[PDB]
Amino acid sequence: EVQLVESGGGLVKPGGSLRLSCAASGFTFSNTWMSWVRQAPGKGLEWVGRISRNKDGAKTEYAAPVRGRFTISRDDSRDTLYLQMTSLKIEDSGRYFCTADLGEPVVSRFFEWGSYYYYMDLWGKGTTVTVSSASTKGPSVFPLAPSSKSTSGGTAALGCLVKDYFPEPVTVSWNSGALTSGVHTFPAVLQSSGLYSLSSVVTVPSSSLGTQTYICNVNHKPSNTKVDKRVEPKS
Amino acid sequence: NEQELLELDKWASLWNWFDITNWLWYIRR
Amino acid sequence: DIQMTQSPSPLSASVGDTVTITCRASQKISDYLNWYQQKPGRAPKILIYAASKLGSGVPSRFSGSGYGRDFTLTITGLQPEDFATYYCQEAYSSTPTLTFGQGTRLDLKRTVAAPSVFIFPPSDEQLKSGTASVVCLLNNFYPREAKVQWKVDNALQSGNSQESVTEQDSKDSTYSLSSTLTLSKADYEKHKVYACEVTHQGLSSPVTKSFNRGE
To answer: Is A69 at the interface with chain B, CB within 8 A?
Structure first.
């Protein structure tokens, strides 16, 4: 059908370079303008740069934050768009989308003939880039002990703190998967140190403390480390 | 698509929105 | 350069309700505006271009209007599939900047619920490591809007805490927030009281949950 497939995204150190590529199909790549759009985690969309057809000269126009560092090119021989990123910064991390753009000529008003309406018509799934000096490191799980300052009537709260790990993917369960009601695993947060950190908490009745045994199972496959932490009530 | 367009005719070419704007600009100039 | 402002981040609406999203602009842009959407985990899609023109394949419930500096996106008949974020985009600059809007998420309407405040001190295991983490938990509440301020010995902390929020639960459609205050063991062991002041709607008065380091 009609789609765009980005690739080449991954891990790269600050100051390094990285090359993305997008293959196109279902339309005439050569007669189409192309653009890149990135999205940092938890943030909004941001235009990167665009390129024109070879018939127009392949003029490239970029966004200020990337101007001078990134380069866009195209290869109509294989319906492929490229993004050559050099001198990468931590702030360049995100999901990079490829786009086939369209223009609508201005018509109604004569004195604006020549200008147009530019928009992003077709998007790809995207590919994630991550710029970090961090090295693979397993997490250090810590208790979030329940106490008097963590109980609301007949309901106590407890959890586990999975702190200082890298890269992103880590999974958390409770009692080898037995407990799943009232549990909340918050999204990972990137810390100033370049390492990630999340918290997994669960609500339970205060009458089950000292009887029920709660163990949070942490699995961080990248470092190949598994942990089972038993959280006990603290005063 | 480009391969099937010029498969036979040398003098075949493609037009898009951008050309239109260049014309309305060429007219206005 | 041209900036783009947008409606509050989570605006609440129920199915079959008419919603509007303002997209104030810094500079006059005539009608060089676009509207997009991206579902929670999918690629963005085009909806409205040239401020009013509707993209091919877009349902007719979406409608855009405006000229110059104030723009609007309206979704008359709200349907569950189109619960996503919407961005407006500038396209007026002769030198293309194509600045996007901040975005606007669609929040599922629900009865207002106040949060359950909890606080966990740092474990003696972590203290031995030379770092201290104090976490404050808000659970089962609505709307999303909620502020958390850390106070150490009646001294407001800023810049050394991070927050993490969950999406609406499929069953009760409430949020849950996690605020973590990071601090060195030495700087944590010199102060006594640690407070988590929380301000949220549905709270007659903002609650303050704290604990003494000695107890």
So the answer is: no
Enter the tokens of residue C181. 């205050």
Domain with residue A117: its CATH number is 2.60.40.10
Q: Which of B2, B18, B22 sits opposite A30 (nearest CB)?
A: B2
Solved by what technique? X-ray
Q: What is the largest CA-CA distance in chain A?
A: 80
User: Cα(B12)–Cα(B18) distance, rounded to whole angstroms?
Assistant: 18
Element (H, E) at C129: helix C124-129
Residues 6 or more apart whose Cβ sits within 8 Å of residue A67: none
**Is residue A149 within 8 Å of residue C193, measured between CB atoms?**
no
Domain around C202: 110-213
CATH number of the structural domain spanning residue C2? 2.60.40.10
Q: Are A116 and A105 in contact (CB under 8 A)?
A: yes
Residues 6+ apart with CB under 8 A from C11: C19, C21, C104, C105, C106, C107
Are B24 and A52 an interchain contact pair (Cβ–Cβ within 8 Å)?
A: no
